[model samples]
Target: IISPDYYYVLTVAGQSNAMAYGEGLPLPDREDAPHPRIKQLARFAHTHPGGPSCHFNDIIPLTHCPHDVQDMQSYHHPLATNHQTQYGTVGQALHIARKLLPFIPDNAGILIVPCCRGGSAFTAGSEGTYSERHGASHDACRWGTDTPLYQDLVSRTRAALVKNPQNKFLGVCWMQGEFDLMTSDYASHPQHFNHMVEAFRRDLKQYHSQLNDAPWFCGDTTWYWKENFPHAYEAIYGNYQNNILANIIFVDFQQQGARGLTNAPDEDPDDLSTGYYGSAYRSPENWTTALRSSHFSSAARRGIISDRFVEAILQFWRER
Candidate 1:
């Protein structure tokens, strides 16, 4: 029963990191109490995993999704979870919301429109619709213009605003591109991303609220991306700096302690040609095959990445 004046809508869109694959729980004291202020537009039914199995557009406290939830079009990574579990959860949205709650208007709640798919990329998944399988992407995963992912992001955002006409469109937080880095079209990643963000700015505009210029905060990928695919990484990140796209902000999480864990057992995806082998970013001491290196650690997401996003958001609003 949310009031029309109770929402500050912030769309969290991108790939796995944006959805969160960090392998730890939210900060201890930060999550001590149930944060009723931070709510999410459930993209799928999370009830089977626990309480508050919400339908699409149903608002619930930032909650975590199970590894096997078949809700929505299923994908390999976490479907749309908040809290971190053994399976690796914990996203920046909830942590970001907690930091943002204090700054928002009184009684205003955050409605996070989650739209992230693991292993999804603009290179492959950006074609056709989500259900289309013509490209090298997953069977039902796509993020291009008019594609299912983009449509979902736009639709869910609009739905949130419709739920409460007074809801404010805050901004977008994005963290993707690792998969695209692997693709042959890596060089075109920047153009692809630029196009997506441009469309996002247009499609998610709210006429009634005049929320036309909500800033976009894009976080950089983990060290693995840089150490392995330096060329692609530089191209994408360099583009962010050069494009100077209005209202587009890039938050560098690496300097703030954002790091990747050691690769999981038998899961060596590094390019041997890079010569980094199993020792690019991670030191030999941490080469233990006990955790996943594909995503950021729990501490980094909450402490580093989330904090960076908060700083960027606050700064944007401060100057604007």
Candidate 2:
């Protein structure tokens, strides 16, 4: 159990915000420094124990792995900042690691499996694969299972667990969905969203073990999606409030402050709140350090909901 992979795992998936985008936001060297305890797989590259590594983007052929490095990639290694690259960005996972560190066993650290693509969607497997389907926008992106992107995301997740059985999956930090709202109605399209989520859960069930039980949170998934945006499922978010989904959770109570209306700081959500971080009023006092609308928005902004994610994670642990 005393291995690099012998750490608690946190899988942060979604679009640009979940990656290294923070609109040129910088991570303190202290935060970016590599750690022996914490490890990460896939950023610039995919993972394979003792495999070839290039601190930059490059590929190595594998006989039996996802067809593309973007598919199922990265080898286990100490955690550190990707630094000024489109392939990555500063994210909620870092702060989340800090938040949960003290709680995790001293002998065990965190392993972050990064599988974020700026333009992906939650397309179901029933539709089948996309010849190539990563949307072309950062502000609005997609995340789906039918596409290779989703396949790669889950493929790598399962790989992380298989490589080191000792490593436990903490939960999924999903920061996606701005794009789906571009054309789907969360309120009426119950089958669309429901089928995908239920199928996603089933896919987890497909894992040898451990995954089916892990929690998947969608609060931060659409962190930057403002209130005026096309969708928000009262039912889905309600589920988060009422413990509707099995191991899946959503943000209802705490995220009250950051509800957007197509354009945040711009407007407020229906529930209730004084200063929605998504509101231009709650805009980060420091935009130079971070972008207000960009998912890579800023550390303070990311905290608005990442903290809630930790809260749920802790709650789940307490229940266990």
Candidate 3:
């Protein structure tokens, strides 16, 4: 259970996306009653039992999403889920709050607690400080006991709530699967993933000791690796989709009209001229065209890849 002092602590976890490049923006340092706190619980390169030694702080611009004009729903224009205006993000949430300062209640503030580790699997229980096979070590700053990532986050969040005791826990968001896709074991035994989600929800309920189920969000990975490697994007997306469809409540961003964008540098550059990537470059005009083609976008506007998705994420918070 989260301590009662802090108003809200949204936990963001998963591989790259959860800890990926944050649209190149500065971390928010706000001053308000519902003060926001950003902390690093664990990471892939930092916690991989056998991976290289890269401290969490080293990844600056560290996992974040940007919030701009595209996030708001003004009377002159309908709300557009583009990268510029969406506030459904760790960074955007802060930005949106700042934007809404005059309109929103002064007591409302959000605390973001990040504990993401790129390229990790659910099967790899968080036990040993390092994985003997990969030559990786656990991050002292983020890891605890031999628990799984979600479990660890719940425990840490509960401790934080107890320490603060003054805020409300809004929700929990997750973006992972690359590691699970990379592991042959997880791919073959997909049921374990479902089990993991169930266990996670149970643990969260137990910790919070609340009757109402806290909102949860999970995202699909856009990374694409060729067929040979176990970490291929197809497998990752497949598992992620399954998780979202079966037990999790995920916003449908894959649909055409959804307000969001995806930046996959690994993609064939030439292909960008036609699909979603191309639309991003078209901008100004493409934005409207893309929005017109989809139902998810309430307004006509091209969505920023990272911002669009994060905005969708923020929508859950706004409603909550």
Candidate 4:
């Protein structure tokens, strides 16, 4: 039986960055092996090729893709990674879990509630109409308060909590806004973000009071976006740091470049003519073609991004 009291739930919400888009080689080795304590809540049903299907809300172990001939892959919401441009299925949550394992009780586990959709945005009808249903097509809907995507997130989170009455709502991991930053309404992103935070806190606290003040671990987009849209990036994220509520822990892992790790080799270090749109920077290793320069490499996700997230969480715990 699942012991809810032994689990801490972290809701991962946002766009592709929050999903599984890492397309690098050399998966996590022995040190990062799968721990039964770290599990993910299935957000959708996926039947692997010639394999069984994992239904929605199923609590399963977090492991590297293609385990035992079947893809017991977590965080690939709508479908498996093999069908998308990002064929190499690596994500950030498992690494975050491993980093967080030492902080919890000896027997406690970490539960990930994955609810990210590729290319979703605040301006993309995320706030659905009254006639709309929950869990609508991801291609058409988005993640505003009361929207289909938001409803799905809430549903999956509650499902994880119900597994045990003692389950704890830890916090949130949000990595989005490339779409919003690319839009004409980029100036309104801060406002939309504020609304998202307020709604999540208000709604999630109904199940666990800690969520009322849970620190949101927010990661920035890739260096490509920051370079391509400097003013918009600053305007959107600056307000988040300055005007938003005090419960956020903004992590700038794009500074991963500081550690000599880059998303692409030829990406210009100091200028805008880096040719990101149709350049190699946008196309990760083994990718069919160039897409968007918003995704980080698998190495960046495991090393820089997840490490910074854990550091921020630990920092908040220390001060609080």
Candidate 5:
């Protein structure tokens, strides 16, 4: 058999919202189809919901969730990434991949490793304290310790790197932290998160040699505006300063120009100059109604949010 071509591996890591919570809003027609080259890794954990068919990527076999369920060489999904377990919510990775394909060769593939649970956090593994369970506690599905979700993330990532020696781990898109915001062990949140980013970079190196510069891009917590918002994002903000490795890239949802994120709690409402609250999520109904529906997105408050998100990462790949 011939050798498989190189593909950029992108990891989607986070909590329930990151797992795939956009229950009602599906991808638009244009965004649903994967260019024949895009392929999600067939791992034992969170693979696609449908069994692999000969329909999607003719180049590689695809599989769905749980190792027992084997997919044929090919798998098909409208949105192309892993949104099998949860429904309705479309992930930012879909948009990230849609924009990413144009930059790579048609023969190359994009492998997505979706590893996130409903209530995971930054303290899920070696980055933070470990409880009796060893990974995250029962309340936290994954985080600083070796939680099941984190273990699967690490293993699946290793699988992707080994599947094709030439494939590169381009970067990881992170969207978590709500649970940590609610739990205990509060003193070292930023320090824990900083190491979490470092751990991701350090651990992945054992699998491949070319990804020395792979950026770990993270998203802001969109759940901050609620009546009793926990300010969980403070840890994300702190992670930036504590980010000694500087391998982390925090993307802002509130501003355009794919603006680099800051330590501030949020976008200043008085400043409409950024086009976030002004142009991105301006509709009063969307703010009040749709925002309410997502609840966490208070989470989707910005479409420009994810749009700028992909744009920034896209630029990172193009220019870096």
Candidate 6:
């Protein structure tokens, strides 16, 4: 039987962006890779601007969660020190992880099993294959059906946990919905997003009852890149709140370049641009409004997400 005590925590689910490489970082080389302590079992595809490379040096074969593999070769340059870039979501996750590590028990180890594929839909599941009968196609996955990708993640994660039960298997960190953003049905129908969250939570719980109470950290999708889609941002935020009600922690990414540890020197320090996702949306009025609004302002705020006007979310895990 897998001993939960063997590892500290495990993270699974989502696309290339989930793997962590973003537009700002240098391409993967053997020397400049991330710390060996962080393990990536997910593969990669070439999607520019944002992709799984956001998380590590390069892609590797899938390894079961919490099964330590020390011999894995590094994929980036060795000389690259402090290679933190905020242009992507992984930088924030890594930063928060480092900060939270000391707070967690020392014996616990961190295992990150990222299963992300860019342009993938929830309907496609982990296999990257979609069913036409369920409306699965190269353009969209059947959001209503049980996607093979999600099923694979659940099964694989469960099997891994069963093998090495020592790992605590912390809550999932999800960054997706960009593909869903394109569809009018998803963009206009906020309830569909809610249904998806509820379904994910239910499925996740079915795999590990203990993790049913696990906190999910989700990043909101940015619509600034494609201005034609006005309702995209609203729908995502609406769905984001539903996740919170389901006990998933939310991370605001509306303010692209702001506070915290970031690689962009040109970014505004006061803004702490944790919510913004694309540069196309950046404007003086938006920045000013974000600063003054305090609702969905940036990552700095800690409060309940109320309405479209409000951007910040409540941090249920804050250190008292």
Best by lDDT: 4
The parts of candidate 6 lying over 4 Å away from their true place are 1-5, 10-12, 15-17, 26-33, 42-96, 122-127, 130-145, 187-193, 204-212, 223-228, 242-245, 254-320
Ranking by TM-score: 4, 1, 5, 2, 6, 3
Give the Å error, residue 255, model 1: 3.4
Candidate 4 global lDDT: 0.62
The deviation in Å at residue 94 for candidate 1 is 0.5
Per-residue lDDT of 180 in model 2: 51
Worst 10 residues of 6 by lDDT: 64-73
Runs in model 4 deviating more than 4 A are 1-5, 26-32, 46-52, 64-87, 125-136, 209-212, 254-289
Candidate 3 lDDT, tens digit per residue, 64-95?
33111111111111122342222122222333
Q: RMSD per prediction, one decimal?
A: 8.2, 9.5, 12.4, 7.1, 9.4, 10.6
- Model 6: per-residue Cα lDDT at residue 10: 46
TM-score of each: 0.76, 0.64, 0.51, 0.78, 0.65, 0.54
Error of 6 at 166 (Å): 2.9
lDDT of 1 by residue, 39-107 (tens): 777644453243445665667666432211123222112222433221224456777888888998777
Specify the highest-TM-score model's number: 4
Candidate 2 on 226-263: residue-level lDDT in tens? 44452463443444445545777764323444543222
Off by over 4 Å in 5: 1-4, 43-50, 53-88, 122-140, 223-227, 230-232, 255-303
Q: Among all windows of ten consecutive residues in candidate 2, which has the lowest summed lDDT?
A: 57-66
In model 2, what is the error at residue 136, expressed in angstroms?
Answer: 15
lDDT of the structure predicted as candidate 5: 0.49
Candidate 2: TM-score? 0.64
Off by over 4 Å in 2: 1-5, 43-88, 123-142, 184-190, 206-212, 221-224, 230-244, 252-296
Tens-place lDDT digits, model 6, residues 152-258 = 44444554455454555566666566566666555543555456556666666654634425555665543332244546655665566564355665565445433
- How many collisions per candidate? 2, 37, 37, 0, 18, 60
lDDT of candidate 6?
0.38
Report the candidate with higher lDDT, 1 versus 3: 1
